[PDB]
Motif scaffolding. Sequence first.
Motif, PDB file in Angstrom:
ATOM      1  N   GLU D 186      18.207  21.577  32.563  1.00  0.00           N
ATOM      2  CA  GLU D 186      17.628  20.244  32.482  1.00  0.00           C
ATOM      3  C   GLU D 186      16.697  20.222  31.277  1.00  0.00           C
ATOM      4  O   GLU D 186      15.789  21.065  31.186  1.00  0.00           O
ATOM      5  CB  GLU D 186      16.856  19.876  33.752  1.00  0.00           C
ATOM      6  N   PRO D 187      16.892  19.301  30.331  1.00  0.00           N
ATOM      7  CA  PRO D 187      15.984  19.217  29.181  1.00  0.00           C
ATOM      8  C   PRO D 187      14.627  18.669  29.594  1.00  0.00           C
ATOM      9  O   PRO D 187      14.544  17.724  30.383  1.00  0.00           O
ATOM     10  CB  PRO D 187      16.714  18.268  28.222  1.00  0.00           C
ATOM     11  N   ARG D 188      13.568  19.282  29.053  1.00  0.00           N
ATOM     12  CA  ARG D 188      12.160  18.963  29.325  1.00  0.00           C
ATOM     13  C   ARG D 188      11.871  19.095  30.823  1.00  0.00           C
ATOM     14  O   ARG D 188      11.583  18.122  31.524  1.00  0.00           O
ATOM     15  CB  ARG D 188      11.763  17.574  28.797  1.00  0.00           C
ATOM     16  N   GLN D 189      11.986  20.346  31.279  1.00  0.00           N
ATOM     17  CA  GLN D 189      12.108  20.712  32.684  1.00  0.00           C
ATOM     18  C   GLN D 189      10.932  20.236  33.530  1.00  0.00           C
ATOM     19  O   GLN D 189      11.099  19.336  34.358  1.00  0.00           O
ATOM     20  CB  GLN D 189      12.247  22.233  32.799  1.00  0.00           C
ATOM     21  N   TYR D 194       7.939  25.665  24.821  1.00  0.00           N
ATOM     22  CA  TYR D 194       7.771  26.508  23.659  1.00  0.00           C
ATOM     23  C   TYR D 194       8.805  26.127  22.615  1.00  0.00           C
ATOM     24  O   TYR D 194       9.960  25.849  22.944  1.00  0.00           O
ATOM     25  CB  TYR D 194       7.938  27.965  24.055  1.00  0.00           C
ATOM     26  N   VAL D 195       8.395  26.113  21.358  1.00  0.00           N
ATOM     27  CA  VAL D 195       9.270  25.751  20.251  1.00  0.00           C
ATOM     28  C   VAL D 195       9.712  27.024  19.561  1.00  0.00           C
ATOM     29  O   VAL D 195       8.871  27.839  19.177  1.00  0.00           O
ATOM     30  CB  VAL D 195       8.542  24.832  19.262  1.00  0.00           C
ATOM     31  N   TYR D 196      11.018  27.237  19.432  1.00  0.00           N
ATOM     32  CA  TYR D 196      11.512  28.429  18.760  1.00  0.00           C
ATOM     33  C   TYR D 196      12.359  28.019  17.567  1.00  0.00           C
ATOM     34  O   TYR D 196      12.848  26.893  17.489  1.00  0.00           O
ATOM     35  CB  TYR D 196      12.365  29.324  19.663  1.00  0.00           C
ATOM     36  N   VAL D 197      12.536  28.951  16.638  1.00  0.00           N
ATOM     37  CA  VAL D 197      13.351  28.761  15.448  1.00  0.00           C
ATOM     38  C   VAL D 197      14.462  29.794  15.464  1.00  0.00           C
ATOM     39  O   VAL D 197      14.200  30.987  15.658  1.00  0.00           O
ATOM     40  CB  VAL D 197      12.505  28.872  14.167  1.00  0.00           C
ATOM     41  N   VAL D 198      15.698  29.338  15.268  1.00  0.00           N
ATOM     42  CA  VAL D 198      16.873  30.196  15.286  1.00  0.00           C
ATOM     43  C   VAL D 198      17.545  30.146  13.922  1.00  0.00           C
ATOM     44  O   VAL D 198      17.857  29.062  13.418  1.00  0.00           O
ATOM     45  CB  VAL D 198      17.848  29.769  16.392  1.00  0.00           C
ATOM     46  N   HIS D 199      17.748  31.314  13.323  1.00  0.00           N
ATOM     47  CA  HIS D 199      18.550  31.446  12.114  1.00  0.00           C
ATOM     48  C   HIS D 199      19.945  31.924  12.489  1.00  0.00           C
ATOM     49  O   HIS D 199      20.090  32.931  13.192  1.00  0.00           O
ATOM     50  CB  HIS D 199      17.925  32.425  11.127  1.00  0.00           C
ATOM     51  N   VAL D 200      20.956  31.218  11.989  1.00  0.00           N
ATOM     52  CA  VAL D 200      22.356  31.412  12.342  1.00  0.00           C
ATOM     53  C   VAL D 200      23.163  31.540  11.065  1.00  0.00           C
ATOM     54  O   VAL D 200      23.087  30.668  10.198  1.00  0.00           O
ATOM     55  CB  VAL D 200      22.874  30.226  13.173  1.00  0.00           C
ATOM     56  N   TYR D 213      18.259  26.415  13.118  1.00  0.00           N
ATOM     57  CA  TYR D 213      18.137  25.636  14.335  1.00  0.00           C
ATOM     58  C   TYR D 213      16.748  25.816  14.914  1.00  0.00           C
ATOM     59  O   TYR D 213      16.122  26.871  14.780  1.00  0.00           O
ATOM     60  CB  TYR D 213      19.162  25.997  15.413  1.00  0.00           C
ATOM     61  N   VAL D 214      16.282  24.754  15.548  1.00  0.00           N
ATOM     62  CA  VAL D 214      15.019  24.727  16.263  1.00  0.00           C
ATOM     63  C   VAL D 214      15.316  24.370  17.708  1.00  0.00           C
ATOM     64  O   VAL D 214      15.928  23.332  17.980  1.00  0.00           O
ATOM     65  CB  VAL D 214      14.050  23.718  15.635  1.00  0.00           C
ATOM     66  N   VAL D 215      14.884  25.219  18.633  1.00  0.00           N
ATOM     67  CA  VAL D 215      15.103  24.973  20.048  1.00  0.00           C
ATOM     68  C   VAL D 215      13.758  24.785  20.723  1.00  0.00           C
ATOM     69  O   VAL D 215      12.757  25.402  20.340  1.00  0.00           O
ATOM     70  CB  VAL D 215      15.932  26.086  20.732  1.00  0.00           C
ATOM     71  N   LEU D 216      13.725  23.877  21.689  1.00  0.00           N
ATOM     72  CA  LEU D 216      12.551  23.625  22.508  1.00  0.00           C
ATOM     73  C   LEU D 216      12.938  23.952  23.934  1.00  0.00           C
ATOM     74  O   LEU D 216      13.910  23.402  24.455  1.00  0.00           O
ATOM     75  CB  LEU D 216      12.081  22.174  22.414  1.00  0.00           C
ATOM     76  N   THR D 217      12.185  24.841  24.562  1.00  0.00           N
ATOM     77  CA  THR D 217      12.577  25.293  25.880  1.00  0.00           C
ATOM     78  C   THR D 217      11.359  25.578  26.730  1.00  0.00           C
ATOM     79  O   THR D 217      10.280  25.894  26.223  1.00  0.00           O
ATOM     80  CB  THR D 217      13.449  26.536  25.802  1.00  0.00           C
TER      81      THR D 217
END
Lengths: 48, 296, 295, 299, 48
Positions: D186-189, D194-200, D213-217
């Motif tokens: 579920e988004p925004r649980q 926490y904001v993370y940064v993903v390099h792909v 990519y930037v993920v918020l979880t």
Amino acid sequence: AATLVRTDNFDVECLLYSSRAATSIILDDPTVTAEAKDIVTTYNFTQH
Amino acid sequence: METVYCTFDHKLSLSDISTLCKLMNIVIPIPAHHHLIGSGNLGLYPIVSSNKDYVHIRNVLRTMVVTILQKVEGNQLVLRKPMTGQQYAIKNTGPFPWEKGDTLTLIPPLSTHSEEKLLKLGDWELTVPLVVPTAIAAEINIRLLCIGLIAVHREYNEMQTIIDELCSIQYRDVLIKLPDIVNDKQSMYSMKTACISLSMITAMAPDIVRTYIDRLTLEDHSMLLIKCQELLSKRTTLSTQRCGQLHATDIKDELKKIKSVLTMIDQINSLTNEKTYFVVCDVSADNRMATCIYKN
Amino acid sequence: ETVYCTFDHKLSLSDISTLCKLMNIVIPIPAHHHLIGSGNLGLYPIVSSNKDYVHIRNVLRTMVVTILQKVEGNQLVLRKPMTGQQYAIKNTGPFPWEKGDTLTLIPPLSTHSEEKLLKLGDWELTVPLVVPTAIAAEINIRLLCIGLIAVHREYNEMQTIIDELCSIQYRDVLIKLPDIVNDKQSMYSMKTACISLSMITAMAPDIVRTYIDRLTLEDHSMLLIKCQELLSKRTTLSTQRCGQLHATDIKDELKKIKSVLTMIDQINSLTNEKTYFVVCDVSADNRMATCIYKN
Amino acid sequence: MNSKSSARAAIVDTVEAVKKRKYISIEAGTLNNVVEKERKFLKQFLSGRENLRIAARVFTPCELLAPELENLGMLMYRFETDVDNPKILFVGLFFLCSNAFNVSACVRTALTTMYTNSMVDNVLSMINTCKYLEDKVSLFGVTSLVSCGSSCLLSCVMQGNVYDANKENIHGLTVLKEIFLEPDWEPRQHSTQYVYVVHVYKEVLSKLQYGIYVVLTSFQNEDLVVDILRQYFEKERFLFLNYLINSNTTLSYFGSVQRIGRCATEDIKSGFLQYRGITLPVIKLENIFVDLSEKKVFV
Amino acid sequence: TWIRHHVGIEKPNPSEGEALNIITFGGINKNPPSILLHGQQAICEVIL
């Protein structure tokens, strides 16, 4: 043949003698510090 | 926000409140992150009714928010949210001697034969997850992965022949066991990436490494070498040698390949390794409460 | 919380001036403790008197980093850092600090003669090198390569390949790594590390081949085919003589997998290198740097 | 007594706790021979236990940052250089998202027309010709106090809320709407994400193309987040497993995750930037406690 | 194997764990004896 060697440790009470005023102690007034952690506060007394 | 008040929905008794007064300074997770919670959200019992699957409980225990018990007063119960890098005292529950200086992780409760003598109150218990050293945390996660890798090998009574030998493990003169691992499809996903990373170690290993075994066997001789020769002789299903090569000036490629090998090992280790939650500094003589100055 | 260290023996004026030259430094300390003698200070109670290499590496991961703050009349004040706060570190290591770099602790030169920073009564003060993380990984890989090719004999370009491995360069500061083979002052011996790596690379392909047949849930995303290709590029000639001709025990497979997962958590020390420090700004002429403390 | 009375007592105790953290009582005997300015300064005697954020002064050529000086609150990247004269060079998030491969062609060209000059073209050529990306460039922190001088001074936050001075108008991280995505059940649980940064990485038949990519979880634990990200990137991961052995460039992974900091769920709002009239949709996180962990790679 | 047989010292581990590198690194490898009656003992050895 062989020389078996072995050591043994003993509980010994062992008295001391010393002449009077043989050694002097120069010492600090005990210093006080305080560490204020989140759940406890620890007071430490040091003395040199 | 740091402080969380839990007030029990069901009423309690004086034996219950005596156990709670004994039970102080225990790490209890909450999911709510509110200032006022009830008895429904306290503990791990609101999730340990769903299949009791150990992988699942470990996953949601990672998702949880941990707090520390404080100041049981009447029916109310304070929980402190621990801050990062600070010092806290923890009463311990895991059956270990808790040698100082080490790291601690937070693991689901291994169901012993005796029922918990802590709190069972109107179809609700206080399921407290255990605090263990990181080494036996990694050991339990290895045993789960190994039982997965054996559930791969579909048999009848050979599964039992593996489990009764494997499951009883001993660390620091303490016997524990973890039965009821139904080997669901969620651990199969973690088994997939382990298989991938061993495949890449296989493919990307340089010429020096397998040769290093043989040169060290030809040079020196030791007990470690003796059982390494036992394993290398006892399995020989592939053992292909990329033979014709001279250890030629390809040394940058050798560095690149060994960096890759280390990185895949980091990946399998990130699978099998759990997050450390605590770092011990000072332990009482009872080994009953100990201090840590850490928080993730 | 601070730490007082008292020196066991007499100090020279050269010693006290040396400490005033070194009034900021990291010191690893075994015991989270308040009063410490000179016998337990530093890394010399562990290095060269105890276990070697990976054990040293693991221990340096598990010790308490504690920085020098001030030198009293014969005592040292060492403050131990809290996570997330600023501190200051002087630059002892050769490689120049720059802003925003992540820092870590590597074991030093093996037995090198920089007056060992201090001789004092069959005791030396040994500190880890604060060094950026990319350099630390590169030094770890070079030491594994030297420790692997040290065991090979009848190699003709061994000496030039040793010189090539030991010469590294990073932001115009070169250094030669002390482990050139056949000197043997101290190598840290790297033997358990190289043996565990090679047991991983030699035990891996059978285990993974064995489970490959039962791989996936009978409907796969690239787990039988691509992974076969990975196995085939390494072993294009697969399973010729077979040794035992495929008569395996489930307990034997158990012991194989159990050893190969043992070796990973043993080489956990050479797995990662933690960011002990993130340097925010650097002083002029690179004498010291103010960093923040993490992990 | 009165409820409003103990409330005033608590507020006054908060004010005096702030005063205890800010000022220091001086037990120097402080004789009369001072000037009154030095007198009142020895009465106050500030110290810096008040800001609780860690910032860093920064010099960077002003050619590279186009969008950033005007718009406060941006990620920054340290790009070390084999040139001796400037050893580090600081890089905008959007400047590196230009040759991120995720960005569509319209947004990319729009970005390029913000980023058309010779120095920025040469630095894109340097980043392209470098073998991997993740350890020649590196995460640095969050932008505040643009100078826009000759050679621009940037302050930058390592830890804490994003503010220059006087603890006022706390800026927020500006992460492009196209480069962020939130893999959750579920988004925004429930609460703070926490904001993370993903390099792909990606290999389109010739070279490597990175992706930002930037993920918020709500998940804090890096094991949990790389476990959800391998599920998200399973297909490309398998492609690149076939690539990396045949490759000889010194890289060993598909991507890396790194934490940026805490946010708040009610503080996440959309918006748009504009620089020379180029309307650009962004997702502006508002109040950010910046925090960094070590880069955790995944293959 | 036959020397270990006749001098009567157990093989360390049927199922190899990282306790083995604790063993060869240096650790308490023998389980301390379940029964003990008089405290410590150790006897070294010279051939003659």
